Amino acid sequence: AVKYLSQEEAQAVDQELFNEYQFSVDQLMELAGLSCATAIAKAYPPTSMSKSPPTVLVICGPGNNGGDGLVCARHLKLFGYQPTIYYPKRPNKPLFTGLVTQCQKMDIPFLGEMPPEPMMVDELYELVVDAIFGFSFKGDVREPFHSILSVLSGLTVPIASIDIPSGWDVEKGNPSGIQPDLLISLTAPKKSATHFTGRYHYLGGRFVPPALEKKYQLNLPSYPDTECVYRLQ
């Protein structure tokens, strides 16, 4: 029975990965990101899609979720998707700088603004990746995010959330939030992930050292062969 994490649990575990075990943020983000694009490509394969190539909106927030998001975009390009990225609040740090520019020399479009009504989103993108807020977030959804979140939960087309449905109280979830169709739990799943309603819940981040796994008695599922994602249930 794979454990779902308290907010403090996760941040400590995260803590070790950078502290004791010395994974750089570069490293794990790439894999977080790779896991994401993997999950998505599996969930919703291009063959099974309605356009060639299949369009996806990646909506990246200001912290790390954004990061994973950007990686994910780029791998999904590689995987055959035609992503567009909207990245409103960008911190001025080489990491995020780097990932942006990577995406840019992938001929990945960035949008300067969110289209205002969900119907136009639905019309321009087959899948929306929610890269806004992750575990460590603690309410106070400032603009423009409230406004995007607002649009998002109006969509017909499905949303893929990275780690957390943005704006779900990380433990509470949110009865009235956005209800994404795929939730890629990274590292371990989060208490909120029990409120998850949709059709795909992959786990990702094949990097937990078994010592860490036995520490925070995670009972991780065995990933198959060489995969970096596992479907749940």
Ligand X SMILES: NC(=O)c1cccnc1
Residues that bind a copy of itself (CB under 8 A): 20-24, 26-27, 30-31, 34, 37-38, 41-42, 45, 75, 78-79, 97-98, 101-102, 105-107, 206-207, 209-211, 225-226, 228
CB of residue 72 to a copy of itself, shortest distance in Å: 12
107 annotated ligand binder? no
Q: How many residues make contact with ligand X (CB under 6 A)?
A: 10
Q: Which of 191, 162, 189, 187 is nearest to 178 (CA)?
A: 162
The 10 Å CB-count burial string (b at 16+, else e) for 52-83 is eebbbbbbbbbbbbbbbbbbbbbbbbebebbb
Question: Which residues, at least 6 apart from 106, have a Cβ–Cβ distance to it below 8 Å?
Answer: 73, 74, 77
CA distance 119 to 218: 41
Q: Does residue 64 belong to the site contacting ligand X (CB under 6 A)?
A: yes
**Binding span for ligand X by CB under 6 A among 26-34, 47-55, 124-132, 148-156:** 26-34
CA distance 48 to 59: 23
Q: Does residue 193 belong to the site contacting ligand X (CB under 6 A)?
A: no
214 annotated ligand binder? no
Cα Rg, the chain, nearest whole Å: 16
- Cα 94 to its chain centre, rounded Å, is 21
Q: Which of 106, 71, 76, 75 is nearest to 87 (CA)?
A: 71
CB of residue 232 to a copy of itself, shortest distance in Å: 18
Q: Does residue 32 belong to the site contacting ligand X (CB under 6 A)?
A: yes
Over the window 138 to 177, marking each residue x when it contacts ligand X by CB under 6 A and - when it does not, the resulting string is: ----------------------------------------
Partner from ligand X, a copy of itself, none binding residue 197, C-beta < 5-8 Å depending on class: none
Which residues fall in the annotated binding site for K(+)? 65, 130, 166
